[PDB]
Amino acid sequence: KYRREAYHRVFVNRSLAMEKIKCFGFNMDYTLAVYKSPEYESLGFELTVERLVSIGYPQELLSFAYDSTFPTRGLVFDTLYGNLLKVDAYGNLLVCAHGFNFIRGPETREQYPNKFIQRDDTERFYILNTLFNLPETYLLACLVDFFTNCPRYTSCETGFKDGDLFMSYRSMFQDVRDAVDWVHYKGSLKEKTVENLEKYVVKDGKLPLLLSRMKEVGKVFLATNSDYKYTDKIMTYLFDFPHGPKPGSSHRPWQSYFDLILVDARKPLFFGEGTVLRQVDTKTGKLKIGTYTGPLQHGIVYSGGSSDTICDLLGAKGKDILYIGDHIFGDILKSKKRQGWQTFLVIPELAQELHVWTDKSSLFEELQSLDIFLAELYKHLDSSSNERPDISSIQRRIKKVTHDMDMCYGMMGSLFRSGSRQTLFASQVMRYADLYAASFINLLYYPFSYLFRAAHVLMPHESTVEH
Amino acid sequence: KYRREAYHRVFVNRSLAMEKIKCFGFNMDYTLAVYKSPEYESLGFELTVERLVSIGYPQELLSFAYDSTFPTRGLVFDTLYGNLLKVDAYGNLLVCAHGFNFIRGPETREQYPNKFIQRDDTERFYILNTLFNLPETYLLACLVDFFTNCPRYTSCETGFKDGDLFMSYRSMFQDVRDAVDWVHYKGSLKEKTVENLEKYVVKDGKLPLLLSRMKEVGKVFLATNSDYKYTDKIMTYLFDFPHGPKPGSSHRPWQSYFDLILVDARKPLFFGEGTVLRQVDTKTGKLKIGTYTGPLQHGIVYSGGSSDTICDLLGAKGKDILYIGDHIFGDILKSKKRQGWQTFLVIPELAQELHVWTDKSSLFEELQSLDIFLAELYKHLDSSSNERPDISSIQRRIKKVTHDMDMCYGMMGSLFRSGSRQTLFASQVMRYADLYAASFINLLYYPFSYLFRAAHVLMPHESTVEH
Amino acid sequence: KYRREAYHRVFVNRSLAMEKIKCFGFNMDYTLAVYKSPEYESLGFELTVERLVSIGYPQELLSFAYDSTFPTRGLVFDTLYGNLLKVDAYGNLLVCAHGFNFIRGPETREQYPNKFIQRDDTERFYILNTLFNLPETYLLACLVDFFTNCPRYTSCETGFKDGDLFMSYRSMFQDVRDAVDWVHYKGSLKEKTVENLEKYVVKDGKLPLLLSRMKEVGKVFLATNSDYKYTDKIMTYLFDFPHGPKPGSSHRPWQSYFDLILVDARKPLFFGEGTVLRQVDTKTGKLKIGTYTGPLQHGIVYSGGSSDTICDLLGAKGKDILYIGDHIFGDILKSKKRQGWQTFLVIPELAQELHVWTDKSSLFEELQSLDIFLAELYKHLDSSSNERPDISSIQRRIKKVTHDMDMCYGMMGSLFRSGSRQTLFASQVMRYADLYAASFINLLYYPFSYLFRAAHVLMPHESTVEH
Amino acid sequence: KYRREAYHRVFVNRSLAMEKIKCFGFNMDYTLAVYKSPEYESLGFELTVERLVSIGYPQELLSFAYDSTFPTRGLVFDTLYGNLLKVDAYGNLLVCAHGFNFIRGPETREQYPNKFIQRDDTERFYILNTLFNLPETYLLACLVDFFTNCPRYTSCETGFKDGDLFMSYRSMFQDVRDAVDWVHYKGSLKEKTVENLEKYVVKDGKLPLLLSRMKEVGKVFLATNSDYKYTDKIMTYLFDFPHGPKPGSSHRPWQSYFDLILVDARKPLFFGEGTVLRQVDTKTGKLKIGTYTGPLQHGIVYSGGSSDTICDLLGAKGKDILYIGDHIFGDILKSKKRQGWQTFLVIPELAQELHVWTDKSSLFEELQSLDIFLAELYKHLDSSSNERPDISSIQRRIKKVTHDMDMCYGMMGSLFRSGSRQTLFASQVMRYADLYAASFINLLYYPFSYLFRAAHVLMPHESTVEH
Ligand SMILES: [Mn+2]
Ligand SMILES: [Mn+2]
Ligand SMILES: [Mn+2]
Ligand SMILES: [Mn+2]
């Protein structure tokens, strides 16, 4: 079967007829504005450590340097025990690292009955799904690791003693949750991003190309959580080329690419009741007291609003809308809110994941062989056979190799799978995302008539027995 | 790769080393005692209809004949709208049946906001998961269909006018809930099973052979929900052969195969608090005055108890126990109760579903040809090229062929999937079962040294890109 | 101030000028047709018990005798714990009865977190508001009590073991819900009422006198939920006197008193969408082939319809209509449906409750003496003085005397209050009813020019400080 | 019966034994810290207008001067129509003012079907319950009034046109909700309060007196939403006297009056799950990284936390706690959260209310007379009488007089009642408050042994018929 080159591919959870698509919606941060890596994470990391120091934390935090090779996205911080957990779709622990000390085997079960956590218990466990969580994730490890090995800190099971005062991982987590939040919304993160854009944000003429062709088959809108001063800066840079969509054409403003522009969306509340629909005065970047209602002329820019409001202005309905973004949402209203958008989920980790999947075929093959052999020793055996062939050295070599394969993805494994088992993150992707790729940009390699036909997912009795 | 024949396979969700199994636990009903189909469904069906009529439902209910080709296990009854729903792992409706009229396409949105249900509502939706639910599934369809088309009944959104009386589907469903309950627990269902065991229950000497071999390598126990009177009749019939485990050998009683036997288990409550541990007078079948607990001397038959008590009585830890059964439980206590068994789930539908996967390969292969060709019509295309090639006709042949395939399994399709999407049921199997096969009997084809290595389950970007 | 005798009074929640009333609407059942007590309760009680037994409840249910001294109208059945709850306007438990054992003091907290229920849960709690609910109230108590104390039944938190069967209170309640429904709508309850009208229904010539006088000053209509067959029997019995309105005058048919008559009203649905407006063939009692709508010529008897259609047929606006009845509705459409009637609510308990307020004044006055004295023991005291005067004994005499008072109204006390706190029922009366009396008949003592001026309802700082 | 002087009285909704009280909890803002009136409201008003001007609103807003005689607490802003509504306990409109134009009579019904609003519809209606709402309330009127009469503004039904731009009352309301919030939490409101304390906050040596006696019979805690820098300033001023509790005694720090001090409570979330329990470093007023757990020694000061945490540290249970405050809470968790505090609700408006109730007895009397007379004209009348005595001039004089009585409380009537009918605010008081007074300070006139015995609330048939 013909398939495009792996790195251009859009992958398909649920089938989707692109001719049917009338409106393309865009997330900005980490979707059109891909922040550069590991620079941007380093930036967030350092400002968060500097905020933690300024509010009391010890100076050794300034020795911390963000390491992009530790965190995998989607881990669970357990504020009871201070652990970064990699669980599966149902709650089973696949990885448990205390600080940087990976708890391997039976001693996990000591803390976690049945190697199992009830991931609905959000008072105890915080999911770290988003791309911005990456620094917070490495940081939580650094903090747990440092205090655990710092002689002036007595480690107990839920935190650390220091004389009369006790700092629990729950208190420690909230300080980190505050700092992070403070950095995003009151620190210099936006500011220092906007003043060295070439170091932090990607630029690529494929962005104005693809959006322009999208605008010839349908409408294009932007629904971003950032304000207008931030969005104007970021979007001006992404469209700063000495031409427009194609070489030779005049450059045009980034606004000219969107039928509707909405900032201050307040997602996910955006997707329910919303906030009052407001309008931004594009000169001050402040909200106008008035708001222009009616037709959909260009030059207007909205703040607040609702999915319904955006859908009414565009004159669409949910299934006419392909929402393109890096965030995974719930369906807490899908059973009442009659309107339901399609989804394209951006998953940047896929780029390096696909490199491992190809550039490391020797480990996938050699696992295939150790399983061939295994399935051969037991060939002529049934329950009558009482032979116990030694397979320890084999069972050893499968661990060492699937661990090697794991570590190709970094110290916390693949985003989508630990060893054989799938992650909780993979399931949310399969639940939420009709389409997904490493960047939406890969839509450029598909015609807008394209029929995306879902990939079959097989249960064991389907993947391992022939027709 | 070498694989055992499809109909002897045990399938592996999570990997398992059998050499580490020190106890084999058995469900009785629909595990060891496979009731014959469609006879046993019919017998429950007719007694339930007969119980309903004896409380006032019209005499036309007696014209019903149970029909095995309609129900698929695991469907959801909507008590609001009187519909049988086949949903996916996340709540997406795959199939809506009001009685026998299948709601196809857009008028499902009319009743279900995004073709979606919030299946966490155990006041509106009822899962029909179990093999005993099959009659009650088909009954619900018949009842809603009859009152819909009976001229003397006015049909409403949420029920029927029965003259001056309003019969809500929810009130009608609880009537069917109580009748099934009453028939199983107080009617003639058990008695009419015992007095014609050959008509209702499967027999096979493979059962004592296997259980004899399990007792060579580990302890063996029976934890059933039935009473000892019924359990003696059933287990004695199943072991009525003019020889013991092998041919030529002396027959031994069915008790002799179990180091522990437990009736009145009251699962799932069994698996948490439980009930008081009782001891059955094997003679009367009534409970003893006390309970001689202590040594594991076979001859004692317990009533009630808890998972905890079995493990103590057998002197074993959870991970030593492989619990063999046909019921899917939830991990509601997995995060606290330090003891957690391994599981083998018996899924009988697998036999005839494996038949369709093999004797209907004309359809799988043709759908694949329609997918090779589809991919070929778009080989040289991109967002640049604006050809709109007509695919509607071939896009019609894919519907008819996936409908034909879905219909190879009955009117509600495969247990595990609808066309391409996986069923809620498939995912509950995935969460619960370490191993699964059409019958537990299939263990007989594997050495008890076997390493069951799990099947890789691929995401779209895994199944669709090469190494 | 001059007031009419207590037993002739009409009480005023919201003020009303009768001279502005242009239509008088009548509920039939338990308004115009006051069923005799305890005979009619008994007759429904015995048929419901007899319906339950015919579907499998034990024969001891036939030993039950309906007992008028137990139930108070407006109680809440908890389907979880099988309790009859008397709560206040905000959800505070005043009284908890498991069967006939009254839960007093601290073990109510054991079942109810703050002696409180979230009465918005129409899946767990059921309000028993209506005069037809009285039998079903007492029945629920008997049933829970019998299975609690019957030796062959094991009692659980949420139900009973009926041998191998679990009978939940919720499942037991819906059985009683359907039986009452069936008895009213399909059993012999109506027929056994018609064939001994003198035993079951009150008669009084004050009824035609009043309705004759209303027709002098305004239009008059009947909007009942019963059918015309039943309505003819009932209304003809009520008007069977050997004279018309006054003595000496010629009798006239019961129809002659109504400008419009409406059966099969299907209230409350009547009050919104409604049903199609139908016309009854007065001869057969079956529906005509069509409906001759138009002029208001008396002789036409309608079926179905809506509040809207009555107003159109009478050519009147809501505020012209005074709806006389015994049922309390909710303001679920009051904020949109521009049409809203005035209301007179019939509360029969008021007769004997007015008796206790007058013939038990020995108790009210003594409680007041205990309050004068209590206030006297603390006259010269403040946060300065630290005397702790012993009041426990007098604080005991206040309990026994408020219990004695509460018991002057039956085992569940007054309809409107428990000791000092007001009942949920009292506040629903307050929300719904403009006027209220023990019977609508009491209008007869007021001129149709009367200005009903509302009673001031004082807050503590109003009732307890002088001008 | 003996009663203390009206202005010293504590009023009693539900009975409460003060000997039973172990812990006294305190709200700060508007409870211990009574802000002076109308100065403090003026202050908030002006800063909010200045914030509205700075973000775009027209300069004429600076002409606004806060008028304390317009707002009554507890009104409903309807963002659809821009109306301040005074409704009753169930949704019935008692007052409707558009800006300063009081809609009186039938034209209300044009906008409000049945003079009724569904007050649960919080997307449309905002309740203005709190003391801080007073300026926002007057302001909403000023804004609606100004734009309505400003020639350059075209008034429509849901807002105002100004050429191409439309400003809806919903957009207008959110700007006011923002400004207000901004003033409280980022403007100079706290700041300018703290720098002229003698103009804004009341001081009274009865505060340290009463708290000291409370500390001799039980524990005292503070649970305030303000931070520690604000709380220290405010509390130091309230206890700035040249003595301690009594004349002649040494002054002691305000902290010495509390066993537990909690700031940053985040009520009402405080009363559910809470926030992490933190500790404040009393020198910086910033949060310590550590937190001291264990005994309850003085010198420690908490931030965040939970009702449960405060209750555990104090070693109490809900009914041991009398929570003293000016805010009215819901019981959204009262049906699950096992712990439930008693309540003392501070209602400052009561001071002036009680002056009207006494200093204006001539209007209450003259209404009593017009009702005596009314009840006399209709004395010798029944339904036989067809006399229509003219009572228009009387019915006129009752309106003019109950309007005069109303206006003694200000332009929007009493806090607790409009004319005869009670307000929605009065009902929440009766639901939430076990005790209430104009200031908690009145506890000083009651012994701590005092039994507060609820005031009887009477239904019409109880207040108007004798024993
Ligand atoms: Mn984003
Ligand atoms: Mn079973
Ligand atoms: Mn009625
Ligand atoms: Mn306050």
Describe this structure in words.
The structure is a homotetramer of 467-residue chains. Chain A folds into 2 domains: 1-35 and 201-467, no CATH class; 36-200, no CATH class. With 467 residues, chain A is an alpha/beta fold. In chain A, strands 1-20-17-16-3-12-13-15-14 form a 9-stranded mixed sheet, sandwiched between helices. Chain A has a 5-stranded antiparallel sheet with strand order 7-6-5-4-8, with helices on one face. In chain A, strands 9-10-11 form a 3-stranded antiparallel sheet. In chain A, α1 (39-54) packs across α3 and α3 packs antiparallel against α4. The first copy, chain A, is built from 14 helices and 21 strands. The longest helix of chain A is centred in the first third of the chain and has 17 residues, at 133-149. Chain A has helices spanning 39-54, 106-111, 133-149, 169-185, 189-195, 197-200, 206-217, 228-238, 307-313, 350-359, 361-377, 392-407, 424-432, 460-463; strands at residues 11-12, 16-17, 23-26, 75-78, 83-87, 93-98, 101-102, 125-128, 154-155, 159-162, 165-168, 219-223, 260-263, 277-279, 302-304, 321-325, 342-346, 417-418, 421-422, 435-437, 451-452. Chain A is globular and about 80 Å long. In chain A, 42% of the residues are buried. The interface between A and D is medium-sized, with 28 and 28 residues. The structure holds manganese (II) ion (4 copies).
- Rg calculated over all Cα atoms of chain A: 25 Å
The hetero compounds bound to this protein are: manganese (II) ion
The residue fraction in helices of chain A comes out at 25-40%
Count up the domains of chain A.
2
- What is the makeup of the main sheet of chain A? 9 strands, mixed
Within the largest sheet of chain A, what's the order of strands? 1-20-17-16-3-12-13-15-14
Q: How far is the first residue's CA from the last residue's CA of chain A? A: 18 Å
Interface with most residues: A-B, 93 and 90 residues
SSE-based structural type of chain A: alpha/beta
- Tally of helical runs of chain A: 14
Strand content of chain A: 15-25%
Subunit structure (chains A, B, C, D): Homotetramer.
Binding site for dATP (chains A, B, C, D): 119, 129, 428, 431
Modified residues (Phosphoserine) (chains A, B, C, D): 393
Binding site for (2R)-2,3-bisphosphoglycerate (chains A, B, C, D): 119, 337, 432
